[PDB]
């Protein structure tokens, strides 16, 4: 599923992402845009052999199991395919664990290089939340 900006804002808010660990909703919407273009089915293979999955591009090396990543820790205890669903519950629940880790949202390269230090509030402007 390809989410609309406000549509995704509302689903993330409903799932408790607004201000989760101090990160306003705009941060999450901004990260999803630049990580997957709001597409739940997005996949990207990395040079280390791992693959990123879903709306928030969760990595198969540490967070999910895709059956082809050697030394996968599967910290979210879910098959990576579960992260490609039109229902963002699995991705949001795994994202909460990642963000609670240690480096916060810096774990998402797109957030660090394109959202961090910007007016992320603009990502939810006009949305009925
Ligand atoms: C902004 C943007 C556009 C396209 C993709 S893609 O899923 O890797 O093709 C990811 C992020």
Derived from helix and strand composition plus strand pairing, the structural class reads mainly alpha
Proportion of residues in extended strands: 5-15%
How many helices? The count is 4
Q: Tell me the overall shape.
A: globular
The largest β sheet comes out as: 3 strands, antiparallel
Present as ligands are: para-toluene sulfonate
What quaternary form is this?
Answer: monomer
At the fold tier of CATH, the topology name is: Lysozyme
- Count of discrete domains: 1
The separation of the N and C termini measures: 20 Å
Helix-residue proportion: 25-40%
Number of DSSP E strands: 3
By CATH reckoning, the class would read Mainly Alpha
What gyration radius follows from the Cα positions, in whole Å?
14 Å
- Read across the widest sheet, the strand sequence of neighbours is 1-2-3
Run of helices and strands: HHEEEHH
CATH architecture: Orthogonal Bundle
What does the secondary structure layout of this molecule look like, with pairings?
Blueprint: H1 5-14, H2 25-36, E1 43-45, E2 51-53, E3 58-59, H3 89-100, H4 109-114
This protein binds para-toluene sulfonate (TSU).
PDB class: hydrolase
Keywords: hydrolase, O-glycosyl
Assembly: monomeric
